[PDB]
Amino acid sequence: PSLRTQPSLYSGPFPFYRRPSELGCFSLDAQRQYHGDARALRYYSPPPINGPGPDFDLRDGYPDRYQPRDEEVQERLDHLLRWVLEHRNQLEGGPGWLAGATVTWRGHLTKLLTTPYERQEGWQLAASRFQGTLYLSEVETPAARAQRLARPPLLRELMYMGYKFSQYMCADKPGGSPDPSGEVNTNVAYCSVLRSRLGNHPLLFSGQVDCLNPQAPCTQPPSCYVQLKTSKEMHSPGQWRSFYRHKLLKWWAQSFLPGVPHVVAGFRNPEGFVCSLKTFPTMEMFENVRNDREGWNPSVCMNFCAAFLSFAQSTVVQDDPRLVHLFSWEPGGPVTVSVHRDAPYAFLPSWYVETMTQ
Numbered sequence: 001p002s003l004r005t006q007p008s009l010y011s012g013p014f015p016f017y018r019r020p021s022e023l024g025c026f027s028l029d030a031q032r033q034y035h036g037d038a039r040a041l042r043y044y045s046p047p048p049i050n051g052p053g054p055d056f057d058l059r060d061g062y063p064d065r066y067q068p069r070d071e072e073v074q075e076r077l078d079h080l081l082r083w084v085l086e087h088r089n090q091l092e093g094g095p096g097w098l099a100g101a102t103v104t105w106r107g108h109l110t111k112l113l114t115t116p117y118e119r120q121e122g123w124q125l126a127a128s129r130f131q132g133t134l135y136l137s138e139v140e141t142p143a144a145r146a147q148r149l150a151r152p153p154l155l156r157e158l159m160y161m162g163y164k165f166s167q168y169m170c171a172d173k174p175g176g177s178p179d180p181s182g183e184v185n186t187n188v189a190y191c192s193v194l195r196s197r198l199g200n201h202p203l204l205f206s207g208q209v210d211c212l213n214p215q216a217p218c219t220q221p222p223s224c225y226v227q228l229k230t231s232k233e234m235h236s237p238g239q240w241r242s243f244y245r246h247k248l249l250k251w252w253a254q255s256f257l258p259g260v261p262h263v264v265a266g267f268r269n270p271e272g273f274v275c276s277l278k279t280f281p282t283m284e285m286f287e288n289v290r291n292d293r294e295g296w297n298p299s300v301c302m303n304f305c306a307a308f309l310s311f312a313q314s315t316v317v318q319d320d321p322r323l324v325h326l327f328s329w330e331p332g333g334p335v336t337v338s339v340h341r342d343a344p345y346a347f348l349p350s351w352y353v354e355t356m357t358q
């Protein structure tokens, strides 16, 4: 019992995807402490209209003003589960809504979306059903762990430059000014919690959001949010083509799911400076590959994701927070399933299970 991932199997009409609604939010602070409020939310603040063009030094402060998170801490769903626990009696959708939902991180859904096109990076998703609700929690594969531990210095600095770009583009207050003189602390995060539905699969998920744009067309979340990215400056049509085919797919999937309608890219030169900014509206990203023989197709992404959710729901029959069905996938193969109990794979903590049980 496995699930094939070839795009041709999923090339039908675009499935139903509910306009996402923000149910709430939470923040993680510089010490990675949870707070049930928007204190981590920053505000889109691009270069002044009359000033010079961007020249953001993304290397500035690396590494002496860099406070990296501890990647050996496995948080799994814990922060989202705290939000759910604290809001379980205030969820919309009527009685039993949560029991019919699938609960996960936005990025887990992103990896499902891009699976039909992914050629390098496999994944593992642990699944447990508990009080009807299906929970999906990513497991770091042994190969991803090894590449994390052997991360080249170049790639470590590139992760910093991404975070640093937000420091140049966002302010602590609406209409305020950025202040890049501080530290880059990757514990800090603002997370939007969303309701959606894909096909007949209700979803509750959360995703980190870079900033709110007081100038957005719509002021209500998630339509007012902006996702920030960096990418190498491109100079040839072939370079742009490769960017549309590979990078844009991931940018699209990540922001389509939570309803974030704009991705703003800082293009960086080889010396590490952002010299150019470009806005990519999420619902226009596919236009760049719509007539491309080697392009991606959002219908394939969403139809595979729906097929996986159906596959996971029908595979995880037993309601048991200590039981895990592990869905494993590597490029060139189907999604396969193995069954595990308790540690290490079981991921729903007793502080969640016990409260929900009572």
Ligand SMILES: CC(C)(COP(=O)(O)OP(=O)(O)OC[C@H]1O[C@@H](n2cnc3c(N)ncnc32)[C@H](O)[C@@H]1OP(=O)(O)O)[C@@H](O)C(=O)NCCC(=O)NCCS
Pocket (backbone or CB within 6 Å): 069, 071, 105, 106, 107, 108, 110, 138, 139, 140, 141, 162, 186, 189, 191, 206, 207, 208, 228, 229, 254
């Ligand atoms: C809080 C969190 C869980 C929210 O999840 P999410 O929104 O679903 O995560 P996404 O994968 O979509 O990533 C969104 C952002 O989180 C941040 N982030 C994600 N993984 C990160 C890491 N390993 N280190 C630092 N920051 C990270 C980045 O700012 C990223 O933005 P980008 O896509 O522009 O790079 C996520 O930010 C996070 O911390 N993920 C780390 C998970 C992890 O390390 N798992 C272990 C391997 S399985």
